Write a protein that binds this ligand. Structure first.
Ligand SMILES: O=C(OCc1ccccc1)N1CCC(O)CC1
Length: 282
């Protein structure tokens, strides 16, 4: 069923809350036993948001391999994403270790460091060229190379150095800075442009490791970004684009991380983005 019509049918009937609860009821439940070990309590931002054991990213260290991060592998779309929480004061070194070890080119940040008067994630990248950051626990150095500030997003060029081998890599930081404190954006135009610019960078392409995507918990805004990208890629690839079922794509993605799309309003915004995105493509 053409989703644009499914959209108007749900809106006229005001059933967004009902569709959303149906997804919550049918979603996968897999064990998260490593996330709940007492040694990992200060590595989790939220007690109710954990990576499944089968899809968790493992750090390459014998001490403690745990980070709150999941690999979302989309087989038909041929895209992979790592979805993770906003880094904590004691996990900023783990975060950059993961980027290094997974060979990522891009980090996508969908939150501000402070929102609604509270800290939503650590200040985990340098703000000035001449004041670099050293992570002694993981033996990494991170330098700000350049910054491009636009009305709806900022793009930064970072240099990550493995101090053990003296190898360096260029990481691109894509920071969406205008998601409102309350609700979802009124139009998806600025969110779609932002996705286009991440795609244009190479960060989502198969010659690199998976993109790292985060917000505060790594399930809500983060869910919206990967769901929109995968649905638009499938519309490009298939003979019948009408066949793309956003609810079925979301349940596939929920096999790899719990809770993706946190509200009925985020579900409606994801439909609008794919639809308004489908409009521009034709
Ligand atoms: O918002 C856009 O279109 C919708 C869309 C974005 C990303 C992936 C699929 C569809 N952009 C910004 C403007 C640029 O010219 C190119 C398109």
């Amino acid at each position: 069923m053409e989703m644009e019509k499914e959209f108007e049918q749900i809106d006229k009937s005001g059933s967004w809350a009902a569709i959303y609860q149906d997804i919550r009821h049918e979603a996968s439940d897999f064990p998260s036993r490593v996330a709940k070990l007492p040694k990992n309590k200060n590595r989790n931002r939220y007690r109710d948001v954990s990576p499944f054991d089968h899809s968790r990213i493992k750090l390459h260290q014998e001490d403690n391999d745990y980070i709150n991060a999941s690999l979302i592998k989309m087989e038909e779309a041929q895209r992979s994403y790592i979805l993770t929480q906003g880094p904590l004061p004691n996990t900023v070194g783990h975060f950059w270790e993961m980027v290094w070890e997974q060979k990522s080119r891009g980090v996508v940040m969908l939150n501000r460091v402070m929102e609604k008067g509270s800290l939503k994630c650590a200040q985990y990248w340098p703000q000035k060229e001449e004041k670099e950051m050293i992570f002694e626990d993981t033996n990494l150095k991170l330098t700000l190379i350049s910054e491009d500030i636009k009305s709806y997003y900022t793009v930064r060029q970072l240099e990550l150095e493995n101090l053990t081998t003296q190898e360096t890599r260029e990481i691109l930081h894509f920071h969406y800075t205008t998601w409102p404190d309350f609700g979802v954006p009124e139009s998806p135009a600025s969110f779609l442009n932002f996705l286009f610019k991440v795609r244009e960078s190479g960060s989502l392409s198969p010659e690199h490791g998976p993109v790292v995507v985060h917000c505060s918990a790594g399930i809500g805004r983060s869910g919206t970004f990967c769901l929109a990208d995968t649905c638009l890629l499938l519309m490009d690839k298939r003979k019948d684009p009408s066949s793309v079922d956003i609810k079925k794509v979301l349940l596939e993605m929920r096999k790899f991380r719990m809770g993706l799309i946190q509200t009925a309003d985020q579900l409606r915004f994801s439909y609008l983005a794919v639809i308004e995105g489908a409009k521009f493509i034709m």
